[PDB]
Design a protein that fits this description.
The structure is cut from a larger assembly and holds 2 copies of chain A.
Chain A (H helix, E strand, L loop, with lengths): L1 H13 L7 E4 L18 E4 L8 H8 L1
Parallel strand pairs in A: 1-2
PDB class: transport protein
Keywords: transport protein, membrane protein, ion channel
Entry title: Electron density map of GluA2em in complex with LY451646 and glutamate
């Protein structure tokens, strides 16, 4: 989750986060990192999420 | 110098700082603001500088 943010930051700096690029975060924590930065860039970003925040079970956990 | 950084930040977020765009900072402090952000974006940025840091007079002032 750390080495990813470093890369993502560099990607935005050099401007390789615009339309045409496609990144895949190879970890079980896609929403664990900050995506607001490469969110409006244009480049498509995909990943994997193991903690479904749509489950009433998980939703209840977060509530507390 | 402040309202400029706000715009520059927004510009990078929406990704309108890549090659093809051309910005002109209409103030006497071009190097007064942070440019490292829209520096590698690709978009050309121009402006105006009144404090020439190449003058031995100014260079001596900065030394102190």
């Amino acid at each position: 989750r750390d080495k990813v943010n470093d890369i993502v930051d560099q990607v935005i700096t050099i401007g390789k986060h615009v339309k045409g690029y496609h990144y895949i975060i190879a970890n079980l924590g896609f929403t664990d990192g900050d995506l607001l930065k490469i969110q409006f860039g244009g480049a498509e970003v995909s990943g994997f999420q193991i903690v479904d925040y749509d489950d009433s079970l998980v939703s209840k956990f977060i509530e507390r």
